[PDB]
Structure formats: C-alpha cells, structure tokens
Amino acid sequence: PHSMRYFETAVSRPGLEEPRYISVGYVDNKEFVRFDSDAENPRYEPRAPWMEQEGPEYWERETQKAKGQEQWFRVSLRNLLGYYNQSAGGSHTLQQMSGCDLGSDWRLLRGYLQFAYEGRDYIALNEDLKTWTAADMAAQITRRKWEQSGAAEHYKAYLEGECVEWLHRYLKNGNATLLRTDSPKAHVTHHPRSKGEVTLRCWALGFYPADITLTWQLNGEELTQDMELVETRPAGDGTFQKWASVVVPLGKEQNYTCRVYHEGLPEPLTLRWEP
Amino acid sequence: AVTQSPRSKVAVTGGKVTLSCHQTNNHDYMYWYRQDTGHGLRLIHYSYVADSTEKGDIPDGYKASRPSQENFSLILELASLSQTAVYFCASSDAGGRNTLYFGAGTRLSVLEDLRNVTPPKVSLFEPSKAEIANKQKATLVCLARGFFPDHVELSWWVNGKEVHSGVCTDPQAYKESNYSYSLSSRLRVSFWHNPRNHFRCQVQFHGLSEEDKSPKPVTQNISAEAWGRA
Amino acid sequence: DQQQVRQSPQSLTVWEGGTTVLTCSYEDSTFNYFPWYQQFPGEGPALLISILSVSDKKEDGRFTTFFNKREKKLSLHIIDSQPGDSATYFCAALYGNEKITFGAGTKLTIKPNI
C-alpha cells in the first residue's frame, strides 16, 4: 500500500522579494527531503537519516531542479494575476501535489498531479494521465495551453516511470526506519465535572505512526454519538497523542471500557477506571 | 518572434562590440548561443528575469545584460580574433523542456586590421538567348565578387518592390582566394522581352561603421541594372 | 573534455530520393528527453521533432527518430530525401528540466535529381 508525494508551495509577497518557494517530499507520508528558497543557502536537504546515503550529485541536481521549479512558479503566479485580473501588491499562494501510489507488486496504482490557487482546486491531471479537469475559466486557459504543448505526455512519463523507479529505491534504502512503530501507553482519568455526572477520558501517548482508534463502550454497545474525540496531535518528540472522552453518572464508572487499536500493538488494549 | 541586430558586424581586435536581441513571446528565459562555422550551439550567457544574467558554458570574454524582459544583450569589451563566429539569441517559457525559439543570426568578423576589407564588384549578366528561344524563360544572373569578408546582403529589386519568388540566391559565399569571397544569384522570369520592366541586383556590404578607424568601405548598397532587350 | 552529445557524421551529402540517417550518442544515461533542431542556411535553429526515454520511435511523416536507451544512442531517419531538407541537423539531450545540450550538428546536403 505504498506511496511517494512531493508537496510544493509558492507565495507572492508585495515588495522587493521574489516568491517564496518550498518543496517537501514524502515517502509513505514520512517527510524525507525539503527545499526552501528562504534558507541561507537554498538546496534540497535530507530529513530522515536514511537519505544521507545519497551522493553529492543527487543533491546538486535536485537542487538545480528546484531552482527551475522556483522560476516556473514565479511565472505561473504572474500569469494567474493576469487571468483573474487581480491587482498588484497582494499575497497569493500557488500549490502543487504530485506523486505515485504503489502496490506490493511494484506496479503503479495511481498517479497524481494537481494544483490549487488560493487554496481552491485549479487544475488536475485525471486518473488516466492524458486529460485535464479545469475548475474555473482561468484554469481552462491553462488547460488549452497544456493541450497544445502536450504537457500530460511528460507528466505521465515522470509518474509511471521515474516516480515509481525512485519510490522503489527509497524503500530499499530506508527499510529499517519506516518499519519503526511505537506502542500507545494509555490510561484513564476521572474528572468530577458537573452535579450528578463525571467525565471519563482515555488517553493514548507515546505512539507512532499517527493513525489510531479509540472507542468507549457501555455493556457491549459503542458510544459514538455521546463521545468527545480530539484530533490526533504531535508530542514534538516524534510520537503522537490522542484522547477520547465520555460523560457518565457517578458510581457507575466501572461499567465503561475504553479500547485502543494500533499497528505496533500486538493486541488492542482495553481499559477501565482505577481509584 | 525573436529578432537580433545587427545582422552582421566587422570589428578590430580590442574594440567594443555589442550584440542585441529583442523578442515578443513574453518569455522569461533568453539565451546567447555561439556557433562556429555552422557547427555547435554552445551557451555563453542566459537569463530567467531582468535585471539578472547567469553564466553559461562559454562565458569567458563575454558579458550579458537584460534590461527589459523583452531585450537581451551580449557585450564584448575587447573583441579578440577568437570571438569571430555567428551568434544566436533564443527565448523559451520557464519550466522544463519548453522549445527554444531562436533568432535568425548575427555574423561577427574580428580582424587584426581593416586593410584587407574590400566591397564587392557587382556584375549583371543578361539571360542566355539560347534559353530565351528554347524553354521560353530568362535567367538574369547577378554576381558579387572580390569582397572581404563575407558580410553581403543580396536582394533583387524590379520596378521598385521585390517579389521573393523566382530567386535562386546562393547559400554560401565562395572562397575564390584567401582575402577574396564571391556570391552568385539568379532570377527566373518570362515579362522580360518588354523594355518597360526595370531590373536591379542590389548588394549591401556590411562593412565598417562611421565610428571605426583610401576608399574606406562603410556599410553600403552597390547595385547594377538593366532594361528589357526584346 | 566531456562530449555529452556526439554527432556523426559532420557533413552528409546524398542524392535526392534516398533516405538519410543521422546518428547521435549521449554520455549521461539519465537524459530522458531528446529534441532535434533543424537549421536552414541563414535561418536560426528550429525544433524539428522530439522523443522521450519511455518511447523507441517517434515519427512525423517523413522524419522519424529512434531512441535506444541500452546502447545509449539516438538517430534521425528522413525517408524521401528532398532538397528542401538541406540544413544542419542538431541532436539534443537533457534530464528533467535541466538546460538543453546540443551536439555539434550534422550538415546535410540533399543533392537534387537534375
């Protein structure tokens, strides 16, 4: 169920400064490379330790690629101002997501190439890698321009070929590091909250990767319509945190059981309130 | 459209020479390329926005300059003999694999001294009277000859304007000696019997400018003409 | 030093009607886009036809290019060689969005029937 993704951003700035360009590469949703035009000495930089493998030429040529992309976004931003007949002295964002999904058979599942202007979908390559979807009229100008130049043939060639070739290479190079997981340590807390009722809250900490499920249940059944759940959040050390919580009556806390499902867990933890 | 100027240029070793380019493609990337005797397209300097330029593969002795987005200039501060070559400007959209659109070319001769420079002697030969009777067509030949170096623009002219259809004007000059070039040119027509039709072989010699240090052969138009022999 | 694109021959004269074969070798195995540029005397170079690594042949009518990744060589074949086709033909290669790298160019004279 594997993937590569390169996320790219350009931001216009009113005044003397050219647009800021940031490119981030992801393997299996794990950041491994970054480029930032605002850096002191702008180049692609490794992020995971397993990329220090690659030699000077890799960095040097990827850095040269970035610098061409930078100009590409600079020119694309300008053209877009013209299309939407926008005024000068604004800050506008251009964004690109691009990559390939992969089976365990090392075979292309899906190719992705899409753009957004001002956080709205602008243009995207369709699943076939041959045709385009244009969100508005300005995008339709682009679509025509790209049909006449034969752009999709070239994106296709990158996606089916080079994206996939390179995703293979990266998974072989950092096999030990993507394997890593961290078990949730979980506990329950008790928060005399109102008059009559309490809050029970199931924490899960120290865990990686981020994906996780927490469930409260009362005597067989699952309590989804009366539960409060928080978006999963990073600790900042590499691990993650999440908690789920329920509003129960005092005295009957032993009835309720929390449950925690995770990849790195050899079996799902079940939990109950203790004094 | 990519349009260079001047189209030809003669210079003395140590002079300042300045090639210019204009383009109306609204492209950001512009380029100066060097060709040497019909072979090679080596990059000297390029630019992806004004007012910056970047080094190419062959920058030594050359300096570029991008005032507008539309204009791009290569500059030789002290012309050497080794910078005698043809130069091409180009433009292209930013991003990868975009097609280079190239200008039509600028020829540059660099010379020790301007002594051997000589403008052409222009001859007009009237069409063979064996051909006039035989295939019923008149080939007015024109010949430019004894010029140096090959920096000659040969147009035909008639009653005033020029047709451009009927002209079999030579591609290359011929090296009839070491300091002596030559260039044939044809005109194919029928109209000729009539003596009302005017015919002219103009050749423009791209010689010295007035700035540059005996008939001093400047940039000049030397022509030869005939009337209809029925 | 580094001949990244090697073109052969330098000049090629052929009798009208023949087929011309220009050949080209590149050093950098990563190159994955190859345009050919055609240069008529006095005119500037202009793009003739192009092919990507992923294909083995591209063909526009009379002209047709042959990429071959393994032997790391590329070639142009013109089939009904007219004198219109007389020009310098330039072989090019690049990776990704890097800048184009031209050959030295092969000068083709197609001599006319008579």
């Binding site: 490119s23 990827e62 590409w72 752009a151 390179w166 | 930013a94 991003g95 990868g96 975009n98 | 990704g96």
Partner: peptide
C-alpha cells in the same frame, strides 16, 4: 526524485 513542470500556467 522530484517532479519538474513544463509550460507555465
């Protein structure tokens, strides 16, 4: 390796 775009928008 990273994608590279072609014609501008």
């Amino acid at each position: 390796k990273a994608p590279y775009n072609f014609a501008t928008m």
